[PDB]
Amino acid sequence: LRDNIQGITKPAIRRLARRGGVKRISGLIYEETRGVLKVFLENVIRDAVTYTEHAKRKTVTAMDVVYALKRQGRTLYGFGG
Amino acid sequence: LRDNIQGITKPAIRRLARRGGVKRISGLIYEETRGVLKVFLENVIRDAVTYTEHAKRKTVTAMDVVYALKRQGRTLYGFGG
Amino acid sequence: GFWDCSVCTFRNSAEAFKCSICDVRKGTSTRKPRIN
Amino acid sequence: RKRKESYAIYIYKVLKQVHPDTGISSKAMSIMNSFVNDIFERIAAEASRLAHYNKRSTITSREIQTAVRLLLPGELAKHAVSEGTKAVTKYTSSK
Amino acid sequence: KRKESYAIYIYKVLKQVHPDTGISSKAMSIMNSFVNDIFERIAAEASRLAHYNKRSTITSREIQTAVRLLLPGELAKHAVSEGTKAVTKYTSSK
Amino acid sequence: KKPHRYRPGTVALREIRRYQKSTELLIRKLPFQRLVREIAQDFKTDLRFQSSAVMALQEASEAYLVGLFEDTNLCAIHAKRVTIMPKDIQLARRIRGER
Amino acid sequence: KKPHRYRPGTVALREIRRYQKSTELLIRKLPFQRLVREIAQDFKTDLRFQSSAVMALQEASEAYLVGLFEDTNLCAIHAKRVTIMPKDIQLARRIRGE
Amino acid sequence: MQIFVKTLTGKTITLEVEPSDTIENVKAKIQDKEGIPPDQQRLIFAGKQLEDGRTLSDYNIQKESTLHLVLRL
Amino acid sequence: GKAKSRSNRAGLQFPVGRIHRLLRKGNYAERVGAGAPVYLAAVMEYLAAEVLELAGNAARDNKKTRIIPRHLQLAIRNDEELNKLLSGVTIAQGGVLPNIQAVLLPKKT
Amino acid sequence: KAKSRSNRAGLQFPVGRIHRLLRKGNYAERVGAGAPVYLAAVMEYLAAEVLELAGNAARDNKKTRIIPRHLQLAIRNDEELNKLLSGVTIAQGGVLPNIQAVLLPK
DNA sequence: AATACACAGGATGTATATATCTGACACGTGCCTGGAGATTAGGGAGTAATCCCCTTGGCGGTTAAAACGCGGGGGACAGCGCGTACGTGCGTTTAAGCGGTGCTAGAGCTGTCTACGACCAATTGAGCGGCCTCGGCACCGGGATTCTCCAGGTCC
DNA sequence: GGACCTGGAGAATCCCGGTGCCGAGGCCGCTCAATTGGTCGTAGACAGCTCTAGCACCGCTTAAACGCACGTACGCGCTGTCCCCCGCGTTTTAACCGCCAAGGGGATTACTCCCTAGTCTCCAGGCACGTGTCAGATATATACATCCTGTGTATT
Ligand SMILES: [Zn+2]
């Protein structure tokens, strides 16, 4: 666990953009996408670990993530609750 | 009580535009702004009047307006509650 | 059987789930399809 | 081994009552379960707030009706209000 | 018909921080609304945390976790410090 | 001979500074009150309004409109222009989620 | 003599249709899981994750990225273009309120 | 005979026809007014798709009839 | 006589008594009336029946019998009021609707 | 021979009133002892921060009283407070002075 | 001989100082409802102890996907010319706004009194967990149709 | 000669059968949570009264809205260039599926006891009125600060 943000490879971002409907992609989009994804993940995982620590647990469950997303305004259907 | 939407004169829309930071304004912005304002007011007044109807009252108060705004993510400070 | 359409007014086959003419999807028993 | 309640059987019964020859997958059932839970919690919270505003201590069918009239769009709200009124009237006139 | 609000406490805090400064009525109303909003947000988050954890009691730990979940960055750290100090002062004095 | 005439742009900037420095209602109060009464007339007949309710409605409406115009200006600047057109409002309201 | 070569802009539309009809996960699972473990390390030492947790995180993140790209495409088309650039992403994130 | 064509767009196009007239002439009159060729024109009335080889009287079309036009491409 | 569940009495399928218990123990008020669970059960039943009926019609088109998340996703996003009600919801394994802007399409007559 | 709990906690905000509001507010079946104290302390700190900033703003503007304009300025100029109050509008508050660079004649 | 560019002067606009006068804030007084203190008691939550399900680390092989390189075409971006659509300013026109008076509808409280919801104990059936199949759906294989794309013919 | 038109080749996707695995679906046994019956207190409906404040109307200033004229700057269309990204190919690389092994920690059960709900008594903190001074709003007069047009003249 040293540097894995680069694991979101260029073809993966291209595929996600294709599902988004984008025809042509400039060469500077990949760093921007990586930064945006990192920020989103940081927020959600911070909330999830806060819930996990309050419950005196050591394992992050699916309900922790669902609640973290629920408080952030993006509810998720298909994992419980 | 007819065509009272026209009471929002062009100088008023220009004044509201200036406070937002706008320099040049096209000649077809005023109708768009009137439509936007009408839809927004329809939503808020609908919520306020149904709050008033549940309370078995015949007067729309400031608390009803604040509650209508609160349930739309538009919290207002300075009229109580 | 069949199901009439609120848009194209053309009767559609019972075992059809869209209008073969105006492409409007089959509506629910209570709520009818929109203008478009 | 410990009981864990859900809305599965009621969703399945309504599905069979609408589509006699159609099944459902596990993930789709989970999604419908979450949908029903979300609707319940939304309406209950709105009714609670609206009862507290008027300095009342009980929530009744009128509060649920007003919450439905507040939370749903037009046609959906109208049909749900009709369904609720019919259900309550049938429930009252039976012993 | 005794209505109540937070006016006197906000005035006392203001005079504690700025001895020679006043406040208008509409600023008073805005501060009242701000206080009520903060109270309701933290109370609702603590209630949700209690319900999630299969408990029926709201304690200081629920309020601490709610404040951490609701306030950003430095605000949360300073609020947590203030709450811990207030509780540990209230406990030591019978 | 020729009266003093400012070039196009100076008076607009002057007005921008003026109305960004002040905090007063920019729509005449009575026409807005009449509009409010018109809109509510279609939800309940013989309704009555407290004055503070009308003031709250006006404050919220002005805040919303100023924010929308700010977003419209940003979108217009993105498209390499200075003027605002209805398509800018439409793009801002589409991205926001109001349509 | 010349091997078949599609004109630029035709394989892209095919990819758009293909990925707009499917409902799979477009990111490799193992690198995303490693990224999740790296980010969560900065908050608590020696954490553990349920498989459902990682799956929910991945699904939510991909939905968010697809929505962002939709808005970015709208912004790029607004400026009379076809190619998306970081300006469009920044304008979308500014208007959305992030 | 006066007939109104209630196109799905929302326009009530009006034309003059004859009770024994063929559907082809009725279709051609729309092309005269709008420009839509008869090949691309679809006419809906009482859940029946008219054919150019038939006539108005064959479909039991009475006075003040209302028709619908659908573009199928 | 024999016991008769309140759900059967009200002519519903969703559990009136279970919803009553959830209302009672959910910290919503001091008291809960009698008709409130009945009204709530009717509303939830109707809102579930609409989605299930549309999803069934969608599934039958695809020459399938088993309902999957994709059918629900399509039914919700294509309806206007249903989309409005669920505008801030993400459905796992649902995908997106097919949509390509007109300017990106190639030359058309 | 009665000492208020607010005085004991070292606070200026009420404690018994907040305890009553929690008890009757339908938040749980029970309310602990230190919960109202913690809540009151947090609210007092937030109010003190906002009032200090607004008072500094008014003094620099050559005033004695605080008006909503000063509150709006202090709130919107602080990143943490702006994030905490991202959904709230202040009546008679105005807006920050902001004009885009490309609109200026240079 | 030409043309730009800094300078000088007129000119509006804004910022500063000074007098005044009015209404909103700050303080005092009285009292009444709500917080504090003491005492009782039942259950919520802490805590030790046990079992086993699920998470983590490891190794091997198979192969699709990611990484690197190359050739060219469609698009991004700069530059220029036109024209028309807003911005600025001036002379009328309309209607908001301030002040005042008069009417009464409807909020807001107070006093009764009964129907309705909470609480408890017993008991019976609805709903959950574990099992055991089959038929829907996924995957493979093969051919058939649809959709691009460039190389020549011919007409304008 | 060049642009419009077409034909043939080629790649990609779709339709049709055939085989196989496992997840949905119905059953069986149990057990606990919904139901029935009775008791008891109070929340809420209903009526009656008081009095704030919302509505309507009038009358007069006077700033704001309105209509028109003129010109200039900006929006839009067109053209040309060049380098960046797309499509395809070949060589690496690490994701993925499969087993096996170990133990940390979620989940549950039983026991003890402290903390909070509920009650009554007492009294002072906090609120509603009432009153009066001064901060701020408004009017007036200088004085500084950007905006614009015209010109001298030096550079080219
Ligand atoms: Zn149809």
Residue numbers in the entry:
A (entry chain B), B (entry chain F): 22 to 102
C (entry chain K): 23 to 58
D (entry chain H): 28 to 122
E (entry chain D): 29 to 122
F (entry chain E): 36 to 134
G (entry chain A): 36 to 133
H (entry chain M): 1 to 73
I (entry chain G): 11 to 119
Q: What did the published study say regarding this structure?
A:
Monoubiquitination of histone H2A at lysine 119 (H2Aub1) is catalyzed by the RING1B subunit of the E3 ubiquitin ligase Polycomb Repressive Complex 1 (PRC1). Here, single-particle cryo-electron microscopy (cryo-EM) uncovers that RYBP–PRC1 uses two different interfaces for contacting unmodified and H2Aub1-modified nucleosomes.
The vPRC1:NucH2Aub1 sample also showed homogenous 2D classes that were distinct from those obtained with the vPRC1:Nuc sample, as they lacked the characteristic density for RING1B or BMI1. By focusing refinement on one nucleosome surface, we obtained an improved map with partial side chain information that allowed us to assign the extra density to a fragment of RYBP (RYBP23–58) and ubiquitin. The RYBP residues 47–58 adjacent to the NZF form an extended loop across the entire H2A acidic patch. The side chain of RYBP R53 contacts H2A residues E60, D89 and E91. Moreover, RYBP F39, showing clear side chain density, interacts with H2A residues R70 and D71.
